[PDB]
Design a protein around this ligand. Sequence first.
Ligand SMILES: *[C@@H]1O[C@H](CO)[C@@H](O[C@@H]2O[C@H](CO)[C@@H](O[C@H]3O[C@H](CO)[C@@H](O)[C@H](O[C@@H]4O[C@H](CO)[C@@H](O)[C@H](O)[C@@H]4O)[C@@H]3O)[C@H](O)[C@H]2NC(C)=O)[C@H](O)[C@H]1NC(C)=O
Ligand SMILES: *[C@@H]1O[C@H](CO)[C@@H](O[C@@H]2O[C@H](CO)[C@@H](O)[C@H](O)[C@H]2NC(C)=O)[C@H](O)[C@H]1NC(C)=O
Ligand code: 2BY
Ligand code: NAG
Lengths: 400, 407
Amino acid sequence: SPPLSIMGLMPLTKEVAKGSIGRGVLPAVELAIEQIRNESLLRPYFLDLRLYDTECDNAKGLKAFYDAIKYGPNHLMVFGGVCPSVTSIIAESLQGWNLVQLSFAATTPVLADKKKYPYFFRTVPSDNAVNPAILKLLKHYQWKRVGTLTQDVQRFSEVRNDLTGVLYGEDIEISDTESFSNDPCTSVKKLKGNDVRIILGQFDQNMAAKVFCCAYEENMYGSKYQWIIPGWYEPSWWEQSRCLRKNLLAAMEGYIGVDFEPLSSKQIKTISGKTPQQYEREYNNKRSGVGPSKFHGYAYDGIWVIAKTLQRAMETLHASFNYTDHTLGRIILNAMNETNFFGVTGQVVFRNGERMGTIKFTQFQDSREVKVGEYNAVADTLEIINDTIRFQGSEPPKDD
Amino acid sequence: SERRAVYIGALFPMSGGWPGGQACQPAVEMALEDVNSRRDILPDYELKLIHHDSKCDPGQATKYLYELLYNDPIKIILMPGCSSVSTLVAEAARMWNLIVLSYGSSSPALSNRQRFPTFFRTHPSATLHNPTRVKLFEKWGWKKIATIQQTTEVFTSTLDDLEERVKEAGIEITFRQSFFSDPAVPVKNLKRQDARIIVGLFYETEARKVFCEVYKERLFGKKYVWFLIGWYADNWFKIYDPSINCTVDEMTEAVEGHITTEIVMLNPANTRSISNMTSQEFVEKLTKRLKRHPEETGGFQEAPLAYDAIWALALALNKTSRLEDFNYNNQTITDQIYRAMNSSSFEGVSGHVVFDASGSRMAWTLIEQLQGGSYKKIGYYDSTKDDLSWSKTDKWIGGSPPADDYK
Ligand SMILES: *[C@@H]1O[C@H](CO)[C@@H](O[C@@H]2O[C@H](CO)[C@@H](O[C@H]3O[C@H](CO)[C@@H](O)[C@H](O[C@@H]4O[C@H](CO)[C@@H](O)[C@H](O)[C@@H]4O)[C@@H]3O)[C@H](O)[C@H]2NC(C)=O)[C@H](O)[C@H]1NC(C)=O
Ligand SMILES: *[C@@H]1O[C@H](CO)[C@@H](O[C@@H]2O[C@H](CO)[C@@H](O)[C@H](O)[C@H]2NC(C)=O)[C@H](O)[C@H]1NC(C)=O
Ligand SMILES: NC[C@H](CP(=O)(O)O)c1ccc(Cl)cc1
Ligand SMILES: *[C@@H]1O[C@H](CO)[C@@H](O)[C@H](O)[C@H]1NC(C)=O
């Protein structure tokens, strides 16, 4: 039984905050590896995932990668890369060792650049994947005029920059573009003054409470307004200075949250023979004391992408690894581009290393965010959940 | 009885945004020959070079840094060239307890002791222009300054340093504008606000676009003073660009009178440095080692900084003198060198070599003014000693500098 070695790179230490992602995904990775092994899918070979702690640090992460090359077995590909700066360093260098990389948690749009990161692939949709989804939501409700409120931080300005190209050639006007660093109030007052009704917000959890307080003070809430903001904030994020909690909740009422879908809502058998719901139960059993991670499905499907890629690569060699082999690296790279199966996160397909996945729409209703719809990136289709999504008026708000 | 070999792991950008290793590698090799034939420097050691072409690419540099660190011999220092390559190697080096000495990095971000703990550069930071800018505002009595920048990190970091620096001098930044590529509106607003003393930071292509707009908006005259970077190609404004509506004459009209600051990289004087060469002798010696003319040689003007980098290291290693026992797992030797490098003081081919608290080079700046479509040297400034060399060659319409406001 010869090994098919894979370099697992992620933060694993309890001392590192993002170590919770690396640890939360391991039970899902353990489940996928265990199944592939029993079923002897890669017979006679077996999947040999070796784990190396990046510690969510540029220097430690690079040394972890360097030590894996020096002292570790001959890895065929890289699985992981969670933190943005660490992943960018490793992903940029890949061609040097003819290593294809598959990430399950690095969502930075920067990685979509195939000139700089040719050998990088990801099962998780990037931060920008919300933009084609929002476009469908705007078309669905006939919102042709929007305003933007962005935080002056790279994570948010990258998403706002991508929105320009997404809304170009479409019948959608960005009537007002506003930026802020520490206080959103001036920008919110400018949006009110320009009579903006549909707002596309891109700011962190901390700034969101400030944004909604300004919205209450400027009366930018209720039947006439629709806020479309990030959907990745922690639960009860608002509970955690001038506004009262009741006034914040009044302005927050009806906001639309946008984020990737952690698991498929379709009760259909996936590549493993299990439904997404059956997998979720198996993961929750296996995780034990370990805290769950929203990226667990992406890590699970990630392992299945690797197995299927190695299968196609084995076929290509039969039809006719030191890091020296440019050819095998190209075979693995071409094999991964062919990926097309129904996984726990939905249909697992790549468009230039980028995941064509599912985007979740939520709406804040009284006390919490409630799922209101989903966007299928493959089909470029939106499905609004009947009798979930609500508006304070008789009709959804008008754009002017 | 036997001289022990000691190694440098270098990276030279022979391709890329800055193919600076083309003249810097031979300059480093000449500097190693000169240092090794001196018995007063390192009598017991022979400084040897192991290098690779970074291609001014970080992803590429990563393969070679592994090649440098994961193959014998042990290297005592790491020498990268590009700012992008230095940001990668200087942050990673801590894990192997390595001093990083750059000869071509200008990025202000590299002056960050927490992120880059063992970093030194013979190439100064782009922020060195700032004490010269503040002194020129002080000389001509201006307290209200406008700033325009292309949306680049270097320009953002340099302007952030200018804000802090202007305040320590009792001056204020009136308006700050930025553009990714098209300057029509920022130039537009500069005229609206009646901005009078302006600093503009952009690359050469963008400077042409700014000046055509400056051409269109009558934003040049006795009223206006523009400060720019002195590293553009000669007659950068007569250069033809299909994307500029403005003409050579108009553009020659707009650029007229603007001030430039640039780092002095070769001692203008005819004095002899530690090597016993004059600036002219170094230039002549370097021209000989080259396959092609200095003109088609990348980093030809940064070559003295590369030459002086080897001397700075040699002199630092001389001050410490147990080099063969260096290991990546140990901080002992590293820290002694850090201390020795930190207190560098010598005359190099580029001038007096000293580093500030952040490991960044302290140097003279050359001040120039575009007079009759030509740059005339109006002075030099020494930030560390507040020394200003003034030549009475600056020309202003109406015989005197305009002012920051209406009067
Ligand atoms: C640094 O810079 C300059 C490089 O241009 C060097 O200065 C040179 O030093 C030489 C030292 O002598 C000097 O050459 C001749 O000077 C004397 C005639 O002026 C002559 O007496 C010297 O030779 C000695 O004389 C006897 C005669 O029998 C010989 O047998 C011996 O060889 C003795 O050396 C030299 O022939 C040269 O003129 C001078 N050049 C200048 C421009 O000043 C200097 O050495 C270098 N400095 C260092 C290395 O510290
Ligand atoms: C990568 O895969 C993509 C899609 O799998 C390939 O693009 C398809 O190539 C087939 C040719 O057999 C065409 O019929 C389709 O029109 C292409 N689809 C798209 C969406 O472009 C791409 O050529 C593959 N490249 C590789 C493996 O190098
Ligand atoms: N003088 C060398 C330095 C190299 P870099 O800072 O790494 O781009 C440099 C600085 C500015 C320019 Cl435009 C080109 C090169
Ligand atoms: C180098 O070695 C010794 C020890 O520091 C010292 O006397 C000498 O001055 C140093 N070399 C130079 C050129 O200063």
